[PDB]
Amino acid sequence: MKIEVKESTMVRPAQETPGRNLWNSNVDLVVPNFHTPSVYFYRPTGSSNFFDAKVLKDALSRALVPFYPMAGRLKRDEDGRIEIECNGEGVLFVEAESDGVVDDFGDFAPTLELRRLIPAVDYSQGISSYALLVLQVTYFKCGGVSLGVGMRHHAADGFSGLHFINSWSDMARGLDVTLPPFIDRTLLRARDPPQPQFQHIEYQPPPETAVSIFKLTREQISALKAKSKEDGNTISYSSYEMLAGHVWRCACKARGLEVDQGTKLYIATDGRARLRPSLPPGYFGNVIFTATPIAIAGDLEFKPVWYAASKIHDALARMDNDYLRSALDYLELQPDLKALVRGAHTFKCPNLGITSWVRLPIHDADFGWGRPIFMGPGGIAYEGLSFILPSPTNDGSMSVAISLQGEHMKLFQSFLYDI
Ligand SMILES: [Cl-]
Structure with missing residues (x-):
């Protein structure tokens, strides 16, 4: 299957958004075990503007207003702790075309071949050099479309990430955000002083x-x-x-x-x-x-x-x-x-x-x-x-x-x- 990138855009929020140095809790800093990019498949409806890229990009830019940290970048604070600088630099949105069809993926098992439907992230130019969210809409030969989503784990878990993607889809349909995000991760600040009551083996590294x-x-x-x-x-x-x-x-x-x-x-x-x-x-x-x-x-x-x-x-x-x-x-x-x-x-x-x-x-x-x-x-x-x-x-x-x-x-x- 050939996948050609046609256009790539850094989509910024539709209007200026507030600055902030958003603190990450210890569970935003730990790599979660089950963190993964996701892929959605859609069948054509016969509509002539099916997954129109202008409609998708305008909605994404509007959704990044209430979810502005999603448009931010990682940076280190004065003590060296990774935080989210909410600078509105934006989210990567890639449009690609495939010369195959959705049916080529069969039952949609998550083989390494599905990775090709999400943009690859070059995490080697330092923590600030890349978007926290990358998105790709791939257009297939018989009219089907995939949306691939890759979100850096500091930003959100799966639950908060689907909140965003669903909210973007709502805006694409003309519905403003139904549950606005509540943004303050200091609610997960540890106790002072910190005093564990259990062993936590899940964070102790082990001794074809x-x-x-x-x-x-x-x-x-x-x-x-x-x-x-x-x-x-x-x-x-x-x-x-x-x-x-x-x-x-x-x-x-x-x-x-x-x-x-x-x-x-x-x-x-x-x-x-x-x-x-x-x-x-x-x-x-x-x-x-x-x-x-x-x-x-x-x-x-x-x-x-x-x-x-x-x-x-x-x-x-x-x-x-x-x-x-x-x-x-x-x-x-x-x-x-x-x-x-x-x-x-x-x-x-x-x-x-x-x-x-x-x-x-x-x-x-x-x-x-x-x-x-x-x-x-x-x-x-x-x-x-x-x-x-x-x-x-x-x-x-x-x-x-x-x-x-x-x-x-x-x-x-x-x-x-x-x-
Ligand atoms: Cl198709």
Whole structure:
């Protein structure tokens, strides 16, 4: 597939915006595990102005007025801490053309080939040299379009980033911002003095890859949830805990782990509902923390799926305000946060990462020509990472996108359908 860039624009906010040196909390400075660019696919409607680039760029420039930090750049304060200089320098918007068709991407699994739909970022001319958000609209031969989105993690997590992208789509339709962003990350300042109450292994560094996507129907999901009754168990677990448990159990079996091999599952957890007092709605920044259930492979494989679900349940139930405040305090005491590199190491066999986008508004971006037929990660960056996606047809199905070693993938597919 040839992808040609046709035009590139640095889009500035539509009018001047306030200056500010926007402070980053310790969870805006840590690289989140599950940070990823995303891609949306749209089918042509027959409209002659489908994804008109002037309409998209004018709306983007208007959306950057209330979301002005998105238009800013990174810089170091007087103490060397990375902050966002809100200078309105703008967001990169690339228009590209493909000589292939949307159907060339098949089920839209996040292979490295999807990275080609998001602008590449040259993070080697120093922290100020690049935009915090890069966007690419690619026009395909049969009229389909992709939108690729790459946002630098200091700016926002996925929740705040989709707020922006949805708000841009609203403006493209003529609706002003429905929930204005609340911009003040000092609400996540650590205590003074900082005093952790727990160990936080998720921030302690440790002392061929294939990617696929697999659809489970609403009935398969309901059949999985019903397995909580197995072997007399009386505790009900949610669709999410049972599906996440089943993905973990299936990955252990597909990798052929020994009965006494240990496995850590890292689960992205949004702190917005859990912190006290809870953050104002529209909080703009990062609030993702990591839960870490640990189990023996023989127990996960040989006990019913509710055992893996129970471990996930217990681990998420530990993620309360006390735990999240402790995590911020632990980070405050570390000499170097850049050093807390959460990379390829972390999710490799026998460990695993799972993040769910089921409760995120990933299909709400309608720029005037309809909601997307698919939205998902634009390429999965580390082997051992998995994403649970809600259905773009609103039919109660859920898709599991995952990266595994190639010789484990067909086993994983086989075990995922053993429900
Ligand atoms: Cl097409």
